[PDB]
Amino acid sequence: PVLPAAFGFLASARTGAPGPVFATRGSHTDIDTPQGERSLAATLVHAPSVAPDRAVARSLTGAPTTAVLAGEIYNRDELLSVLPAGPAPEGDAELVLRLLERYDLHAFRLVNGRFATVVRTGDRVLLATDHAGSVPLYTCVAPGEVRASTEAKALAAFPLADARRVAGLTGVYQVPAGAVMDIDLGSGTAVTHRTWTPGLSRRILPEGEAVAAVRAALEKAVAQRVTPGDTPLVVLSGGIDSSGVAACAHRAAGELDTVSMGTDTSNEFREARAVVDHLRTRHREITIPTTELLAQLPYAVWASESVDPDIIEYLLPLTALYRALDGPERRILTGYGADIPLGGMHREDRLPALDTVLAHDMATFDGLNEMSPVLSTLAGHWTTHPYWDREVLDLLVSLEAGLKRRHGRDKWVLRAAMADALPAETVNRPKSSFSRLLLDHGVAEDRVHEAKRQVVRELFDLTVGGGRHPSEVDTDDVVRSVADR
Numbered sequence: 001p002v003l004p005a006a007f008g009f010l011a012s013a014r015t016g017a018p019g020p021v022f023a024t025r026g027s028h029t030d031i032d033t034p035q036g037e038r039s040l041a042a043t044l045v046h047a048p049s050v051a052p053d054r055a056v057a058r059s060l061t062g063a064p065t066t067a068v069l070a071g072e073i074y075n076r077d078e079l080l081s082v083l084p085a086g087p088a089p090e091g092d093a094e095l096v097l098r099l100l101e102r103y104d105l106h107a108f109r110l111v112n113g114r115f116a117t118v119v120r121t122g123d124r125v126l127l128a129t130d131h132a133g134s135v136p137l138y139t140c141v142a143p144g145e146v147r148a149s150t151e152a153k154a155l156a157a158f159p160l161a162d163a164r165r166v167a168g169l170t171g172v173y174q175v176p177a178g179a180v181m182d183i184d185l186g187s188g189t190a191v192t193h194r195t196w197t198p199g200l201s202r203r204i205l206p207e208g209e210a211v212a213a214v215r216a217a218l219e220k221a222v223a224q225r226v227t228p229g230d231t232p233l234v235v236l237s238g239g240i241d242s243s244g245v246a247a248c249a250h251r252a253a254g255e256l257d258t259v260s261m262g263t264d265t266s267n268e269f270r271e272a273r274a275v276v277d278h279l280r281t282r283h284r285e286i287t288i289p290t291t292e293l294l295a296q297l298p299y300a301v302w303a304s305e306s307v308d309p310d311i312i313e314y315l316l317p318l319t320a321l322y323r324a325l326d327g328p329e330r331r332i333l334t335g336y337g338a339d340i341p342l343g344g345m346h347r348e349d350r351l352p353a354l355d356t357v358l359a360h361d362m363a364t365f366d367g368l369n370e371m372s373p374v375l376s377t378l379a380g381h382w383t384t385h386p387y388w389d390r391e392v393l394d395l396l397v398s399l400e401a402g403l404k405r406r407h408g409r410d411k412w413v414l415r416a417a418m419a420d421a422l423p424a425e426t427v428n429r430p431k432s433s434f435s436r437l438l439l440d441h442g443v444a445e446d447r448v449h450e451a452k453r454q455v456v457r458e459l460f461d462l463t464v465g466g467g468r469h470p471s472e473v474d475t476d477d478v479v480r481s482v483a484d485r
């Protein structure tokens with residue numbers, strides 16, 4: 001029960017398909033098609049150690065119905081509490097089906113998870129993402145057919161307003177975060193409903209209550225993410241975010257495994273060691289050369305399916321770390337995203353700008369695929385991010401800026417929240433090679449940024465638009481080809 005029933009999928013709904021090639025690593029399992037050409041056909045990609053059964057559910061309520069879900073749901077007890085009585089669902093896909101029978105598409109306004117799901121009921125097709133669209137979902141829609149996939153590359157081989165076109169691709173759209181698309185298969189018409197939106201108002205609370213609420217929310221979100229009877233792995237940098245996560249996860253599991261990644265030009269091993277000794281975790285340090293780091297370029301764009309150089313450059317270390325892990329497939333928790341709702345980049349005591357940036361960030365995260373599970377599952381590992389849990393996120397986003405920047409410290413309420421579970425050093429510690437290789441390739445700097453965009457854009461074209469494996473891509477030539485422009 002350590003890994004989701006499924007990591008992703010390629011599904012097809014025909015009112016009247018070739019095998020997929022994912023970036024996600026694992027077994028492929030085609031689900032049965034009882035209604036033949038009038039059902040939901042799908043290929044699930046999952047860990048070889050997991051039967052994908054809980055990722056699929058069927059019913060006859062309303063119509064013949066088939067649901068497929070990638071990922072998992074965290075507020076399970078709560079969702080079960082609203083269901084009519086007794087035979088509990090076997091998996092998350094069946095739970096969704098039960099919820100749909102009671103609330104219809106509004107069921108998704110209730111779910112706090114890390115998932116993407118496609119369900120066909122009759123000639124109606126629903127496509128839904130979690131509140132932050134942390135598990136990307138893409139689609140191609142035409143009168144009579146709907147294809148949906150957790151990877152745009154699987155569709156690479158009709159317009160849809162309310163959904164954004166995937167760069168480079170043609171006719172492929174990414175389903176918005178926190179949304180559910182209701183598509184009538186017969187006409188190809190879709191109506192999209194948003195099921196979550198960042199709060200714009202701010203909450204006032206004294207330090208004491210603010211600090212307790214933040215600790216409790218994080219503890220709960222982490223507990224919901226750790227499998228009972230299994231010690232999880234936390235990618236730890238010694239920063240407060242990841243350390244906050246590690247402290248909660250240790251308490252939740254009873255013990256903890258951690259790992260820190262460094263390069264030949266820098267690392268945070270010292271900072272991380274302070275936490276590993278304090279919590280007494282089983283630690284591992286990994287150092288990868290800068291040259292090997294930059295080699296990840298095609299892999300990061302291929303896995304995230306992003307064309308934004310700032311996102312790609314940011315995901316390089318994590319991609320390298322996930323691919324550098326040795327041993328069995330792990331369930332990994334990260335401290336990713338805490339800086340967004342908390343204004344981690346804010347450097348002044350003056351509060352105004354903290355809210356401006358915060359509001360902008362929350363209004364522009366969709367589409368960046370920054371926390372896509374493919375980042376880690378490409379190496380067979382599952383990652384989940386407690387700070388972007390819906391309840392934790394809502395809470396942090398809502399807090400008045402004065403609780404985020406307080407006593408001259410950044411992200412004050414989180415530091416205070418973890419003050420009794422980590423070394424003071426860790427709690428008090430206040431918060432590129434890619435530019436280089438470009439500069440070393442005859443590229444002056446006003447242009448270097450646009451070069452990174454052209455490099456990334458090209459890799460994407462080859463790996464996601466074309467169909468080339470990152471390994472079959474010579475990054476140096478791509479950089480050169482762009483540099484000479």
Ligand SMILES: Nc1ncnc2c1ncn2[C@@H]1O[C@H](COP(=O)(O)OP(=O)(O)OP(=O)(O)O)[C@@H](O)[C@H]1O
Nearest residue numbers: 235236237239240241242259260261334335336431
């Ligand atoms: N080299 C690395 N080793 C281990 N984990 C890492 C590494 N780089 C990134 N991560 C993970 O990615 C996330 C990105 O975070 P970030 O640079 O913001 O530091 P942090 O641990 O979050 O704390 P802080 O933001 O205050 O520095 C972290 O939460 C961390 O879990």
Ligand SMILES: [Mg+2]
Nearest residue numbers: 237238239240
């Ligand atoms: Mg950090």
Ligand SMILES: [Mg+2]
Nearest residue numbers: 241335338339
């Ligand atoms: Mg951080």
